[PDB]
Structures are given as structure tokens and as C-alpha cells.
Design a protein around this ligand. Structure first.
Ligand SMILES: CC[C@H](C)CN(C[C@@H](O)[C@H](Cc1ccccc1)NC(=O)O[C@H]1CO[C@H]2OCC[C@H]21)S(=O)(=O)c1ccc2ncsc2c1
Lengths: 99, 99
């Protein structure tokens, strides 16, 4: 589909058997999701943006569906105010910027 | 143009007569540029990101050309980690997401 940017580009995602809302974020290198108790191992990480850094847990090879488009890759979990789908997954669903 | 997301969507912008690199950031409501000198009046404002809130100077009705496309709107100036072009200007240049 084509998504205009009059409002936040929010879409439903499926991760770890849960449905959530997340932003298609071209400015996000990685995918950062609200706190959730995913199973499996992880590695600590810190990511920076406006305001500073937050601590997150890096899970690798996570299955995630975005508008029926399946992907698999790294997902960061931490106290983020918003769920953001980053370029690591946007590339896997064929998402582009067009103007 | 059509921009894939295998790399950061960085483009050249012209603002205040000066060229700069900036990130096309669909996850940002507003446009935030690193510290610089801009003419005209400004108002102190607060903006929050993933890591908290920063202090910015709000410039209204600023001319800014993004990848050859002209826009006129609000530009926030402050200690952002990178120059980001937010939806307030992405809509003006006709930018949409497509997958
Ligand atoms: C360094 C470049 C930008 C700031 C990076 N951000 C993505 C960005 O889209 C962010 C995503 C975001 C959106 C909403 C709340 C918190 C973060 N939006 C944002 O900060 O926008 C601000 C400016 O306009 C306003 O509207 C939204 C907040 C304001 S981010 O959330 O901090 C982010 C995401 C993945 C990631 N992987 C490595 S670093 C890193 C940083």
C-alpha cells in the first residue's frame, strides 16, 4: 500500500504471538519495541536519540509480521515511548520513500 | 525519486542559504536541526524523543528546500543527534511510504 504522512504511519504488527501498533520509521536504524517478555537469550544495548539514550535488550532472529508482510531480524526491547519499525525490517517488506 | 532503506535516507537540504545533510524521518512529527544560526524571531519550546526532552528554538515559516523540493514550515533548532526532516515538511514535498 501507499501511506501518506498527514498522521503518524502506525500499522499493526505481530511479534511473539502478540498484536501491537508500531511506526514505520525511516529514521530508525533498528527496531525498538515497548517492554515485552520475549523468550530466549539477549544482549544489552543502548540506543540514542533526541533526549539521550535508553537501555534495551537485543533479541536476534525474531519473527515479525507487518501488514501481512513477514520479516525476521533484530528487535530491541526497552522502555521506549513508542513502537518503531526500523530500516532493518522496512527493507525486508519492500518499503520505500517516494516523492 | 524512490529511496530504498538499505542505508540511512540522507539528503541535502538548503536552509538559510546554507546546504546541509538531513535524515528523512517518518517517525518524527517535527523537523529538528542541529545548532545553527537562523535569522528572524524564534520561540523557546520543548520537544521529546526516545531518550527524553530537549530545549529547542522554534522558527516558523522558514524556507527549506529538501532534495530539490521546496517547503515552508516550522523548523526546530537544538541539540538533536542528527538533522531530521519530520512529517511537517515531508508532507509538503509529497512524500509517502510505499510497500
Ligand atoms: C537519531 C535520529 C532519530 C531521532 C532516531 N529516532 C527515530 C525517530 O523517528 C524518532 C522516533 C520516536 C517517535 C515518538 C517518540 C519517541 C521516538 N522520532 C523523533 O524523535 O521525533 C521527534 C521529533 O518530532 C517529534 O515527533 C516524534 C518525537 C519528536 S529514535 O527513536 O530515537 C531511534 C530508533 C532506532 C535506533 N537504532 C539505533 S539508534 C536509534 C534511535
Amino acid at each position: 500500500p501507499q501511506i501518506t504522512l498527514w498522521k503518524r504511519p502506525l500499522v499493526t504488527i505481530k511479534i511473539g504471538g502478540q498484536l501491537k501498533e508500531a511506526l514505520l520509521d525511516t529514521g530508525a536504524d533498528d527496531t525498538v519495541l515497548e517492554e515485552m517478555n520475549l523468550p530466549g537469550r539477549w544482549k544489552p544495548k543502548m540506543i540514542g536519540g533526541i533526549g539521550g539514550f535508553i537501555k534495551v535488550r537485543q533479541y536476534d532472529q525474531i519473527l515479525i509480521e507487518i501488514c501481512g508482510h513477514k520479516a525476521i531480524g533484530t528487535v530491541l526491547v526497552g522502555p521506549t515511548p513508542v513502537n518503531v519499525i526500523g530500516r532493518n525490517l522496512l527493507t525486508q517488506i519492500g518499503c520505500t520513500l517516494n516523492f
